[PDB]
PDB file of all heavy atoms in Angstrom:
ATOM      1  N   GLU A  14      76.625 -16.056  -1.550  1.00 35.75           N
ATOM      2  CA  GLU A  14      77.833 -16.760  -1.869  1.00 35.75           C
ATOM      3  C   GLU A  14      77.414 -18.051  -2.592  1.00 35.75           C
ATOM      4  O   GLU A  14      76.771 -18.937  -2.012  1.00 35.75           O
ATOM      5  CB  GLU A  14      78.610 -17.132  -0.551  1.00 35.75           C
ATOM      6  CG  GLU A  14      80.099 -16.929  -0.662  1.00 35.75           C
ATOM      7  CD  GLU A  14      80.683 -17.732  -1.829  1.00 35.75           C
ATOM      8  OE1 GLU A  14      80.038 -18.715  -2.245  1.00 35.75           O
ATOM      9  OE2 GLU A  14      81.790 -17.388  -2.273  1.00 35.75           O
ATOM     10  N   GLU A  15      77.802 -18.153  -3.869  1.00 36.32           N
ATOM     11  CA  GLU A  15      77.427 -19.313  -4.667  1.00 36.32           C
ATOM     12  C   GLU A  15      77.898 -20.673  -4.204  1.00 36.32           C
ATOM     13  O   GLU A  15      77.253 -21.677  -4.503  1.00 36.32           O
ATOM     14  CB  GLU A  15      77.811 -19.080  -6.141  1.00 36.32           C
ATOM     15  CG  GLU A  15      79.271 -18.670  -6.372  1.00 36.32           C
ATOM     16  CD  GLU A  15      79.457 -17.160  -6.383  1.00 36.32           C
ATOM     17  OE1 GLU A  15      79.310 -16.522  -5.339  1.00 36.32           O
ATOM     18  OE2 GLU A  15      79.690 -16.626  -7.475  1.00 36.32           O
ATOM     19  N   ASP A  23      73.252 -29.275  -3.554  1.00 43.64           N
ATOM     20  CA  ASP A  23      73.795 -30.557  -4.112  1.00 43.64           C
ATOM     21  C   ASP A  23      73.771 -31.662  -3.067  1.00 43.64           C
ATOM     22  O   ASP A  23      73.197 -32.751  -3.303  1.00 43.64           O
ATOM     23  CB  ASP A  23      75.229 -30.283  -4.594  1.00 43.64           C
ATOM     24  CG  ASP A  23      75.784 -31.430  -5.436  1.00 43.64           C
ATOM     25  OD1 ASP A  23      75.558 -32.590  -5.089  1.00 43.64           O
ATOM     26  OD2 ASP A  23      76.452 -31.118  -6.424  1.00 43.64           O
ATOM     27  N   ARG A  26      70.322 -32.795  -2.020  1.00 45.13           N
ATOM     28  CA  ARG A  26      69.650 -33.502  -3.138  1.00 45.13           C
ATOM     29  C   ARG A  26      70.259 -34.932  -3.230  1.00 45.13           C
ATOM     30  O   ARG A  26      69.549 -35.859  -3.622  1.00 45.13           O
ATOM     31  CB  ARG A  26      69.790 -32.774  -4.451  1.00 45.13           C
ATOM     32  CG  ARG A  26      68.855 -31.546  -4.492  1.00 45.13           C
ATOM     33  CD  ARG A  26      68.852 -30.824  -5.828  1.00 45.13           C
ATOM     34  NE  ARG A  26      67.825 -29.852  -5.889  1.00 45.13           N
ATOM     35  CZ  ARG A  26      67.777 -28.814  -6.737  1.00 45.13           C
ATOM     36  NH1 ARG A  26      68.732 -28.597  -7.588  1.00 45.13           N
ATOM     37  NH2 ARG A  26      66.743 -27.985  -6.681  1.00 45.13           N
ATOM     38  N   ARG A  27      71.500 -35.047  -2.856  1.00 47.45           N
ATOM     39  CA  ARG A  27      72.143 -36.386  -2.868  1.00 47.45           C
ATOM     40  C   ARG A  27      71.474 -37.226  -1.749  1.00 47.45           C
ATOM     41  O   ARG A  27      71.391 -38.436  -1.858  1.00 47.45           O
ATOM     42  CB  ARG A  27      73.678 -36.284  -2.610  1.00 47.45           C
ATOM     43  CG  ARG A  27      74.453 -35.754  -3.795  1.00 47.45           C
ATOM     44  CD  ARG A  27      75.882 -35.431  -3.390  1.00 47.45           C
ATOM     45  NE  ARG A  27      76.655 -35.045  -4.548  1.00 47.45           N
ATOM     46  CZ  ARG A  27      77.505 -35.836  -5.189  1.00 47.45           C
ATOM     47  NH1 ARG A  27      77.635 -37.110  -4.831  1.00 47.45           N
ATOM     48  NH2 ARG A  27      78.173 -35.395  -6.238  1.00 47.45           N
ATOM     49  N   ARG A  47      80.306 -14.012  -6.537  1.00 56.69           N
ATOM     50  CA  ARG A  47      81.388 -14.043  -7.519  1.00 56.69           C
ATOM     51  C   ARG A  47      80.898 -14.162  -8.952  1.00 56.69           C
ATOM     52  O   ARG A  47      81.381 -14.938  -9.774  1.00 56.69           O
ATOM     53  CB  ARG A  47      82.379 -15.164  -7.226  1.00 56.69           C
ATOM     54  CG  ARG A  47      83.429 -14.788  -6.205  1.00 56.69           C
ATOM     55  CD  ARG A  47      82.836 -14.504  -4.827  1.00 56.69           C
ATOM     56  NE  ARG A  47      83.799 -13.907  -3.912  1.00 56.69           N
ATOM     57  CZ  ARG A  47      83.582 -13.674  -2.641  1.00 56.69           C
ATOM     58  NH1 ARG A  47      82.392 -13.988  -2.051  1.00 56.69           N
ATOM     59  NH2 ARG A  47      84.527 -13.103  -1.835  1.00 56.69           N
ATOM     60  N   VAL A  50      76.113 -17.184 -12.128  1.00 55.58           N
ATOM     61  CA  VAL A  50      74.667 -16.950 -12.292  1.00 55.58           C
ATOM     62  C   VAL A  50      73.856 -18.267 -12.193  1.00 55.58           C
ATOM     63  O   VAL A  50      74.001 -19.199 -13.002  1.00 55.58           O
ATOM     64  CB  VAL A  50      74.372 -16.290 -13.673  1.00 55.58           C
ATOM     65  CG1 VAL A  50      72.867 -16.035 -13.822  1.00 55.58           C
ATOM     66  CG2 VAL A  50      75.146 -14.986 -13.784  1.00 55.58           C
ATOM     67  N   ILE A  51      72.976 -18.322 -11.201  1.00 54.23           N
ATOM     68  CA  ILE A  51      72.134 -19.473 -10.937  1.00 54.23           C
ATOM     69  C   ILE A  51      70.666 -19.121 -11.151  1.00 54.23           C
ATOM     70  O   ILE A  51      70.208 -18.072 -10.753  1.00 54.23           O
ATOM     71  CB  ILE A  51      72.301 -19.969  -9.492  1.00 54.23           C
ATOM     72  CG1 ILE A  51      73.746 -20.399  -9.309  1.00 54.23           C
ATOM     73  CG2 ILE A  51      71.379 -21.123  -9.225  1.00 54.23           C
ATOM     74  CD1 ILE A  51      74.042 -20.789  -7.897  1.00 54.23           C
ATOM     75  N   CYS A  52      69.913 -20.018 -11.801  1.00 51.18           N
ATOM     76  CA  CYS A  52      68.515 -19.791 -12.016  1.00 51.18           C
ATOM     77  C   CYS A  52      67.733 -20.536 -10.966  1.00 51.18           C
ATOM     78  O   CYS A  52      67.899 -21.729 -10.746  1.00 51.18           O
ATOM     79  CB  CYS A  52      68.142 -20.291 -13.426  1.00 51.18           C
ATOM     80  SG  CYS A  52      68.993 -19.470 -14.747  1.00 51.18           S
ATOM     81  N   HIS A 125      80.700 -16.368  10.113  1.00 21.21           N
ATOM     82  CA  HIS A 125      82.010 -16.232   9.528  1.00 21.21           C
ATOM     83  C   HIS A 125      82.740 -15.285  10.517  1.00 21.21           C
ATOM     84  O   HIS A 125      82.210 -14.195  10.866  1.00 21.21           O
ATOM     85  CB  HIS A 125      81.911 -15.585   8.178  1.00 21.21           C
ATOM     86  CG  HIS A 125      83.265 -15.233   7.572  1.00 21.21           C
ATOM     87  ND1 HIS A 125      84.175 -16.224   7.247  1.00 21.21           N
ATOM     88  CD2 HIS A 125      83.853 -14.051   7.291  1.00 21.21           C
ATOM     89  CE1 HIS A 125      85.287 -15.635   6.805  1.00 21.21           C
ATOM     90  NE2 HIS A 125      85.101 -14.308   6.833  1.00 21.21           N
ATOM     91  N   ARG A 144      83.009 -25.005  13.872  1.00  3.55           N
ATOM     92  CA  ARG A 144      82.828 -24.903  12.441  1.00  3.55           C
ATOM     93  C   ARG A 144      81.345 -24.988  12.077  1.00  3.55           C
ATOM     94  O   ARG A 144      80.880 -24.350  11.152  1.00  3.55           O
ATOM     95  CB  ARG A 144      83.617 -26.017  11.735  1.00  3.55           C
ATOM     96  CG  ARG A 144      85.106 -25.996  12.084  1.00  3.55           C
ATOM     97  CD  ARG A 144      85.857 -27.158  11.383  1.00  3.55           C
ATOM     98  NE  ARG A 144      85.781 -27.085   9.949  1.00  3.55           N
ATOM     99  CZ  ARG A 144      86.393 -26.110   9.236  1.00  3.55           C
ATOM    100  NH1 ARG A 144      87.049 -25.147   9.865  1.00  3.55           N
ATOM    101  NH2 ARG A 144      86.260 -26.100   7.927  1.00  3.55           N
ATOM    102  N   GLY A 158      84.370 -22.931   3.440  1.00 12.68           N
ATOM    103  CA  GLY A 158      85.091 -24.107   3.794  1.00 12.68           C
ATOM    104  C   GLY A 158      84.415 -24.974   4.854  1.00 12.68           C
ATOM    105  O   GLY A 158      84.962 -26.009   5.239  1.00 12.68           O
ATOM    106  N   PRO A 183      80.858 -41.007  -1.407  1.00  2.00           N
ATOM    107  CA  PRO A 183      81.460 -40.658  -2.691  1.00  2.00           C
ATOM    108  C   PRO A 183      82.068 -39.298  -2.856  1.00  2.00           C
ATOM    109  O   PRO A 183      82.773 -39.003  -3.801  1.00  2.00           O
ATOM    110  CB  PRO A 183      80.292 -40.843  -3.689  1.00  2.00           C
ATOM    111  CG  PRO A 183      79.384 -41.813  -2.945  1.00  2.00           C
ATOM    112  CD  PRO A 183      79.428 -41.254  -1.523  1.00  2.00           C
ATOM    113  N   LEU A 184      81.877 -38.415  -1.865  1.00  2.00           N
ATOM    114  CA  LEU A 184      82.384 -37.061  -1.917  1.00  2.00           C
ATOM    115  C   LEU A 184      83.920 -36.900  -1.827  1.00  2.00           C
ATOM    116  O   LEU A 184      84.451 -35.959  -2.372  1.00  2.00           O
ATOM    117  CB  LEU A 184      81.723 -36.200  -0.817  1.00  2.00           C
ATOM    118  CG  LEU A 184      80.209 -35.964  -0.987  1.00  2.00           C
ATOM    119  CD1 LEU A 184      79.720 -35.014   0.076  1.00  2.00           C
ATOM    120  CD2 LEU A 184      79.943 -35.423  -2.385  1.00  2.00           C
ATOM    121  N   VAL A 185      84.585 -37.831  -1.155  1.00  2.00           N
ATOM    122  CA  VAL A 185      86.020 -37.778  -1.023  1.00  2.00           C
ATOM    123  C   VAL A 185      86.455 -36.589  -0.165  1.00  2.00           C
ATOM    124  O   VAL A 185      87.301 -35.798  -0.620  1.00  2.00           O
ATOM    125  CB  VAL A 185      86.765 -37.698  -2.382  1.00  2.00           C
ATOM    126  CG1 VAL A 185      88.208 -38.031  -2.228  1.00  2.00           C
ATOM    127  CG2 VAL A 185      86.131 -38.628  -3.391  1.00  2.00           C
ATOM    128  N   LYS A 187      87.831 -34.652   3.593  1.00  2.00           N
ATOM    129  CA  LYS A 187      89.013 -34.730   4.526  1.00  2.00           C
ATOM    130  C   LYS A 187      89.562 -36.122   4.683  1.00  2.00           C
ATOM    131  O   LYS A 187      89.287 -36.881   5.603  1.00  2.00           O
ATOM    132  CB  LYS A 187      88.599 -34.210   5.879  1.00  2.00           C
ATOM    133  CG  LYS A 187      89.778 -34.102   6.855  1.00  2.00           C
ATOM    134  CD  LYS A 187      89.334 -33.591   8.259  1.00  2.00           C
ATOM    135  CE  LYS A 187      88.732 -32.190   8.192  1.00  2.00           C
ATOM    136  NZ  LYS A 187      88.302 -31.693   9.487  1.00  2.00           N
TER     137      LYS A 187
ATOM    138  N   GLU B  14      79.098 -31.551 -12.637  1.00  2.00           N
ATOM    139  CA  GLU B  14      78.854 -31.512 -11.188  1.00  2.00           C
ATOM    140  C   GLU B  14      78.951 -29.999 -10.832  1.00  2.00           C
ATOM    141  O   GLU B  14      79.985 -29.387 -11.077  1.00  2.00           O
ATOM    142  CB  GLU B  14      79.969 -32.304 -10.450  1.00  2.00           C
ATOM    143  CG  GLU B  14      79.430 -33.109  -9.284  1.00  2.00           C
ATOM    144  CD  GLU B  14      78.763 -32.247  -8.205  1.00  2.00           C
ATOM    145  OE1 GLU B  14      79.158 -31.072  -8.060  1.00  2.00           O
ATOM    146  OE2 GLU B  14      77.824 -32.755  -7.542  1.00  2.00           O
ATOM    147  N   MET B  16      79.134 -28.437  -7.946  1.00  2.00           N
ATOM    148  CA  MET B  16      80.082 -28.055  -6.869  1.00  2.00           C
ATOM    149  C   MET B  16      81.447 -27.953  -7.485  1.00  2.00           C
ATOM    150  O   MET B  16      82.248 -27.071  -7.141  1.00  2.00           O
ATOM    151  CB  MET B  16      80.067 -29.053  -5.733  1.00  2.00           C
ATOM    152  CG  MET B  16      78.757 -29.096  -4.947  1.00  2.00           C
ATOM    153  SD  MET B  16      78.864 -30.290  -3.419  1.00  2.00           S
ATOM    154  CE  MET B  16      78.766 -31.977  -4.339  1.00  2.00           C
ATOM    155  N   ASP B  23      84.556 -19.661  -8.286  1.00  5.18           N
ATOM    156  CA  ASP B  23      84.531 -18.720  -7.132  1.00  5.18           C
ATOM    157  C   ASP B  23      85.911 -18.482  -6.564  1.00  5.18           C
ATOM    158  O   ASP B  23      86.386 -17.346  -6.399  1.00  5.18           O
ATOM    159  CB  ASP B  23      83.632 -19.301  -6.059  1.00  5.18           C
ATOM    160  CG  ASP B  23      83.224 -18.282  -5.004  1.00  5.18           C
ATOM    161  OD1 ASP B  23      84.074 -17.510  -4.566  1.00  5.18           O
ATOM    162  OD2 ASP B  23      81.998 -18.246  -4.689  1.00  5.18           O
ATOM    163  N   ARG B  26      88.260 -16.503  -9.077  1.00  4.71           N
ATOM    164  CA  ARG B  26      87.911 -15.098  -9.072  1.00  4.71           C
ATOM    165  C   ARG B  26      88.356 -14.386  -7.811  1.00  4.71           C
ATOM    166  O   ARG B  26      88.837 -13.285  -7.831  1.00  4.71           O
ATOM    167  CB  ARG B  26      86.431 -14.960  -9.296  1.00  4.71           C
ATOM    168  CG  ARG B  26      85.999 -15.175 -10.747  1.00  4.71           C
ATOM    169  CD  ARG B  26      84.517 -15.105 -10.987  1.00  4.71           C
ATOM    170  NE  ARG B  26      84.288 -15.237 -12.417  1.00  4.71           N
ATOM    171  CZ  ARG B  26      83.091 -15.564 -12.959  1.00  4.71           C
ATOM    172  NH1 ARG B  26      82.052 -15.726 -12.157  1.00  4.71           N
ATOM    173  NH2 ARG B  26      83.010 -15.698 -14.298  1.00  4.71           N
ATOM    174  N   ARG B  27      88.190 -15.052  -6.665  1.00  5.20           N
ATOM    175  CA  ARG B  27      88.589 -14.422  -5.383  1.00  5.20           C
ATOM    176  C   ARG B  27      90.076 -14.155  -5.457  1.00  5.20           C
ATOM    177  O   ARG B  27      90.627 -13.303  -4.754  1.00  5.20           O
ATOM    178  CB  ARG B  27      88.296 -15.412  -4.247  1.00  5.20           C
ATOM    179  CG  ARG B  27      86.843 -15.643  -4.012  1.00  5.20           C
ATOM    180  CD  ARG B  27      86.643 -16.428  -2.742  1.00  5.20           C
ATOM    181  NE  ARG B  27      85.251 -16.494  -2.359  1.00  5.20           N
ATOM    182  CZ  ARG B  27      84.826 -16.386  -1.095  1.00  5.20           C
ATOM    183  NH1 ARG B  27      85.679 -16.216  -0.095  1.00  5.20           N
ATOM    184  NH2 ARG B  27      83.504 -16.417  -0.831  1.00  5.20           N
ATOM    185  N   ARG B  47      73.144 -32.254 -10.277  1.00 10.25           N
ATOM    186  CA  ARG B  47      72.121 -32.322  -9.211  1.00 10.25           C
ATOM    187  C   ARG B  47      71.049 -31.235  -9.464  1.00 10.25           C
ATOM    188  O   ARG B  47      70.483 -30.664  -8.558  1.00 10.25           O
ATOM    189  CB  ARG B  47      72.752 -32.074  -7.846  1.00 10.25           C
ATOM    190  CG  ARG B  47      73.152 -33.372  -7.162  1.00 10.25           C
ATOM    191  CD  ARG B  47      74.246 -34.098  -7.957  1.00 10.25           C
ATOM    192  NE  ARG B  47      74.471 -35.442  -7.477  1.00 10.25           N
ATOM    193  CZ  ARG B  47      75.410 -36.240  -7.939  1.00 10.25           C
ATOM    194  NH1 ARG B  47      76.231 -35.825  -8.906  1.00 10.25           N
ATOM    195  NH2 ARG B  47      75.549 -37.477  -7.476  1.00 10.25           N
ATOM    196  N   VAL B  50      70.912 -24.963 -11.873  1.00 17.53           N
ATOM    197  CA  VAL B  50      70.902 -24.301 -13.145  1.00 17.53           C
ATOM    198  C   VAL B  50      71.871 -23.098 -13.152  1.00 17.53           C
ATOM    199  O   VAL B  50      71.681 -22.155 -12.393  1.00 17.53           O
ATOM    200  CB  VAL B  50      69.498 -23.850 -13.582  1.00 17.53           C
ATOM    201  CG1 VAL B  50      69.562 -23.040 -14.839  1.00 17.53           C
ATOM    202  CG2 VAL B  50      68.640 -25.069 -13.802  1.00 17.53           C
ATOM    203  N   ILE B  51      72.877 -23.150 -14.002  1.00 15.89           N
ATOM    204  CA  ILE B  51      73.875 -22.129 -14.060  1.00 15.89           C
ATOM    205  C   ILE B  51      73.887 -21.450 -15.451  1.00 15.89           C
ATOM    206  O   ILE B  51      73.834 -22.149 -16.472  1.00 15.89           O
ATOM    207  CB  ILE B  51      75.344 -22.678 -13.839  1.00 15.89           C
ATOM    208  CG1 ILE B  51      75.344 -23.372 -12.453  1.00 15.89           C
ATOM    209  CG2 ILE B  51      76.352 -21.613 -13.965  1.00 15.89           C
ATOM    210  CD1 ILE B  51      76.600 -24.192 -12.222  1.00 15.89           C
ATOM    211  N   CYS B  52      73.962 -20.131 -15.442  1.00 19.06           N
ATOM    212  CA  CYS B  52      74.021 -19.401 -16.722  1.00 19.06           C
ATOM    213  C   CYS B  52      75.479 -19.168 -17.077  1.00 19.06           C
ATOM    214  O   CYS B  52      76.187 -18.468 -16.350  1.00 19.06           O
ATOM    215  CB  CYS B  52      73.267 -18.076 -16.589  1.00 19.06           C
ATOM    216  SG  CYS B  52      71.472 -18.215 -16.376  1.00 19.06           S
ATOM    217  N   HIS B 125      88.496 -39.645  -9.479  1.00 16.11           N
ATOM    218  CA  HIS B 125      87.611 -40.119  -8.450  1.00 16.11           C
ATOM    219  C   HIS B 125      87.959 -41.616  -8.400  1.00 16.11           C
ATOM    220  O   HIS B 125      88.292 -42.188  -9.422  1.00 16.11           O
ATOM    221  CB  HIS B 125      86.151 -39.928  -8.881  1.00 16.11           C
ATOM    222  CG  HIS B 125      85.154 -40.430  -7.873  1.00 16.11           C
ATOM    223  ND1 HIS B 125      84.631 -39.623  -6.892  1.00 16.11           N
ATOM    224  CD2 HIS B 125      84.658 -41.669  -7.628  1.00 16.11           C
ATOM    225  CE1 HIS B 125      83.865 -40.327  -6.114  1.00 16.11           C
ATOM    226  NE2 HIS B 125      83.843 -41.578  -6.550  1.00 16.11           N
ATOM    227  N   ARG B 144      95.107 -36.385  -3.483  1.00 18.33           N
ATOM    228  CA  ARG B 144      93.846 -35.628  -3.593  1.00 18.33           C
ATOM    229  C   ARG B 144      93.977 -34.630  -4.736  1.00 18.33           C
ATOM    230  O   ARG B 144      92.977 -34.301  -5.417  1.00 18.33           O
ATOM    231  CB  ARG B 144      93.543 -34.909  -2.284  1.00 18.33           C
ATOM    232  CG  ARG B 144      93.278 -35.884  -1.128  1.00 18.33           C
ATOM    233  CD  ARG B 144      93.082 -35.158   0.194  1.00 18.33           C
ATOM    234  NE  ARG B 144      91.870 -34.351   0.242  1.00 18.33           N
ATOM    235  CZ  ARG B 144      90.675 -34.828   0.317  1.00 18.33           C
ATOM    236  NH1 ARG B 144      90.472 -36.118   0.338  1.00 18.33           N
ATOM    237  NH2 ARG B 144      89.629 -33.998   0.294  1.00 18.33           N
ATOM    238  N   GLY B 158      84.721 -33.178  -2.739  1.00 26.61           N
ATOM    239  CA  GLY B 158      85.407 -32.932  -1.486  1.00 26.61           C
ATOM    240  C   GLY B 158      86.835 -32.449  -1.633  1.00 26.61           C
ATOM    241  O   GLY B 158      87.482 -32.062  -0.652  1.00 26.61           O
ATOM    242  N   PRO B 183      90.310 -16.508   4.166  1.00 39.62           N
ATOM    243  CA  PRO B 183      88.900 -16.224   4.559  1.00 39.62           C
ATOM    244  C   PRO B 183      87.922 -17.350   4.349  1.00 39.62           C
ATOM    245  O   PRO B 183      86.734 -17.206   4.692  1.00 39.62           O
ATOM    246  CB  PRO B 183      88.560 -14.989   3.687  1.00 39.62           C
ATOM    247  CG  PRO B 183      89.902 -14.425   3.325  1.00 39.62           C
ATOM    248  CD  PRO B 183      90.721 -15.627   3.035  1.00 39.62           C
ATOM    249  N   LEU B 184      88.339 -18.488   3.782  1.00 36.82           N
ATOM    250  CA  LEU B 184      87.459 -19.610   3.484  1.00 36.82           C
ATOM    251  C   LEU B 184      87.104 -20.484   4.651  1.00 36.82           C
ATOM    252  O   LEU B 184      86.155 -21.295   4.555  1.00 36.82           O
ATOM    253  CB  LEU B 184      88.027 -20.440   2.342  1.00 36.82           C
ATOM    254  CG  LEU B 184      88.360 -19.732   1.048  1.00 36.82           C
ATOM    255  CD1 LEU B 184      88.918 -20.732   0.063  1.00 36.82           C
ATOM    256  CD2 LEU B 184      87.107 -19.080   0.483  1.00 36.82           C
ATOM    257  N   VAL B 185      87.821 -20.360   5.757  1.00 35.92           N
ATOM    258  CA  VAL B 185      87.562 -21.182   6.943  1.00 35.92           C
ATOM    259  C   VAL B 185      87.640 -22.680   6.612  1.00 35.92           C
ATOM    260  O   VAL B 185      86.782 -23.470   7.014  1.00 35.92           O
ATOM    261  CB  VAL B 185      86.174 -20.874   7.547  1.00 35.92           C
ATOM    262  CG1 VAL B 185      86.085 -21.396   8.972  1.00 35.92           C
ATOM    263  CG2 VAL B 185      85.893 -19.375   7.495  1.00 35.92           C
TER     264      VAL B 185
END
Side-chain angles (χ1 to χ4, degrees):
Chain A
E14 221 304 339
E15 51 268 71
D23 192 318
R26 286 184 170 160
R27 285 171 176 261
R47 277 65 190 186
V50 183
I51 299 175
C52 299
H125 173 65
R144 304 179 63 66
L184 295 185
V185 195
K187 187 182 300 180
Chain B
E14 221 300 330
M16 295 184 283
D23 196 313
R26 282 177 177 164
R27 293 188 170 220
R47 271 62 192 185
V50 173
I51 302 168
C52 291
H125 180 91
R144 296 175 66 72
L184 304 180
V185 198

